[PDB]
Design a protein around this nucleic acid. Sequence first.
RNA 1: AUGAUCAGGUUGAUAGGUCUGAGGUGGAAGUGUGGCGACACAUGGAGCUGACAGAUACUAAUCGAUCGAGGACUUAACC
RNA 2: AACAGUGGUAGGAGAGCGUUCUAAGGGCUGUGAAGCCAGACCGGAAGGACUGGUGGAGCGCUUAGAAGUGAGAAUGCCGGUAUGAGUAGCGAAAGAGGGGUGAGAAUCCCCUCCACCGAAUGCCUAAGGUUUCCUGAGGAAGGCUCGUCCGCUCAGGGUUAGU
RNA 3: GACCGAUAGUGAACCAGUACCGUGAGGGAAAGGUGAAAAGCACCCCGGAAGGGGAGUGAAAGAGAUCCUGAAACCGUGUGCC
RNA 4: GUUAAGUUAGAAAGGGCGCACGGUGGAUGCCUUGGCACUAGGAGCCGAUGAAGGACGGGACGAACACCGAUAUGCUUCGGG
Lengths: 119, 54, 44, 109
Amino acid sequence: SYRKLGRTSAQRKAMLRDLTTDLIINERIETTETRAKELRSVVEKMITLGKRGDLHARRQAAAYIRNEVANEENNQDALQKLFSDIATRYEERQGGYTRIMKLGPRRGDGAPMAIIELV
Amino acid sequence: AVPFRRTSKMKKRLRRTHFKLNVPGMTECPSCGEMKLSHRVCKACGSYNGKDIN
Amino acid sequence: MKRTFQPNNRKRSKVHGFRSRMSSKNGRLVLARRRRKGRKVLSA
Amino acid sequence: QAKAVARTVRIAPRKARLVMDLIRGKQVGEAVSILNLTPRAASPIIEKVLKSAIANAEHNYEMDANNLVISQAFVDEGPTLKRFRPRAMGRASQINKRTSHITIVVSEK
RNA sequence: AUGAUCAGGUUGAUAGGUCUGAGGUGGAAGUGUGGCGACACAUGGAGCUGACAGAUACUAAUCGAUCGAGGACUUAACC
RNA sequence: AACAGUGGUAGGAGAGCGUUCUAAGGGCUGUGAAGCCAGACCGGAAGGACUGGUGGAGCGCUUAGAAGUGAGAAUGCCGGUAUGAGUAGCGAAAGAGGGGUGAGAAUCCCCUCCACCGAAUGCCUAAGGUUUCCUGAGGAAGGCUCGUCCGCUCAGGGUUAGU
RNA sequence: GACCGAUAGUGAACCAGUACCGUGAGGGAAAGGUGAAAAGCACCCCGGAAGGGGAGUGAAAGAGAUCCUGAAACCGUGUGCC
RNA sequence: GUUAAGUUAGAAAGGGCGCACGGUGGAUGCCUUGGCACUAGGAGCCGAUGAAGGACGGGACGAACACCGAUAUGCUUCGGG
């Protein structure tokens, strides 16, 4: 199955969308474990989507990820930065574009942190 | 929904005999020097599985 | 859920003020016994 | 044979004793490791005063870092802070905020 | 519920990807045609797909550590 | 010496024990009194010695007197501490991510998205409160967690009317 | 003073008719003791501090800011026997 | 070392009982700045020449007690020292 993440579907979907946009933004995420585990699959299907790289693909990925700024001097938005750079970088490895590194838990609540980076 | 009698000392300790908390599992870091959890990256050396992580 | 105490300085000093207590004879006895008691705040 | 005490650090003594008993009678150099790698409330406090305890060797009678072990150590109650948490029906229940004394006595072997 | 059980942990298919499917929703976008028009057609059972089943070492199950045997009297029987 | 007797509530009688003062006589005490703590001592009882440790200045004894004179219970009263129990609760709500401070960061600050209210959860202004306002420091207590933070603490500063 | 010695004795030995409660009349607490002298901890180490460990003062530091003595409830730590 | 069936120490996750050392808490002992009840004496009123009792304010910083009153932590003028 798939986790609930302690919130209903609306802000859950908003949460995952926001995290995966952050992933494409800075190629490295610090967050808790279970957010990382359910993060991996979704960002890597968007990576498959960008590898597909056609116009139906552009509109599909537009319908999920959100428009931040990703490279401000080139004004590169997250969609185009994905669809140009990262698909060309990882076009060859037919899956598994994500890594999980686990860490010690936080001081505040003992929530198990994880390191997410795209590699 | 009320304790009918006070709980005596040995009953109290006998209940608490399982409430002790276990040790974590340590393993010696890939980078030398110190102690680390299993499957967690190193806090001090900042490394995991031999590889370095910033 | 209007509680039992609404503050009003004017009504408070009108009904428990020093002039109000001195105006009556019985209030004068109240002042005298409070002063004999030695209260810091002696009248309202 | 060195001793350091906590002397009323604001923490429940039971919550202290739970992480505190697991370092009883083992080598200090790894005891500090297991204790700062277990996540508890008490772990930084006992970490701090334990490092002070071993640190009683610098301007102190001389022992050395290795071959050194906890001899005996325990957690002792301090004076309790009375606090009154308000409660329904205007009942005004009472809560105790406890304080604790933590002792570490460490000797070489 | 957590414990627990079971499948697995690099000589490996345990889980997630990728590809192929089942099945379900059902005719995607973008084009072009007809039409003033809302629209209907072809591209094309197209497009999409959570849990489902097969392959695939792509990513994660790494280095570690801890526990855990050495065995008394008699009757039978033979070193 | 002999004989007999010796359960016991309400009750009645007789013997006593102990405490604080007060007189009389005696003496004990920094070479350690009172009190406290621990002992396998003595008497029929209430109780009373002895020896250690603590303690660091007052106190027994003899005889008599006078009592605020003896606690286990009164849903007694006051103070302290247990039990529940590491339990219930943590007081309507969408954040997340990157930077920065810091000894420590889910909770502080900066930024980008997202979300909520919008005849209001916006903007004025009564009653009322009385510095809670601002600036700079700090984090023992208050903050139902944390807190480098503030409506908390500390040191300054701030309210100008002929309409 | 054959009166009390800090749950006593005035409510009040202590900034008490205070704090606090009540709209008001009114009600009404708790809270004494370092040392002879502050001689009240220079200096060092841990630490952000607090707090400790040392060094020093004293007759005493277990005497270090509810600081004479420190009973009991309660709570811990080693253990002889089970 | 095989039988076979018999007999028994042994343990401790923890605990119970004794001992020792702690902390908490402030009983007890000791002490008194206070209070109670009296004895002997004095005194038994103050106030428009503004009382009792307060508010405000006064000091080399500022709070509170206490003292005082824009002459404000006091002054003049007799005595003691």
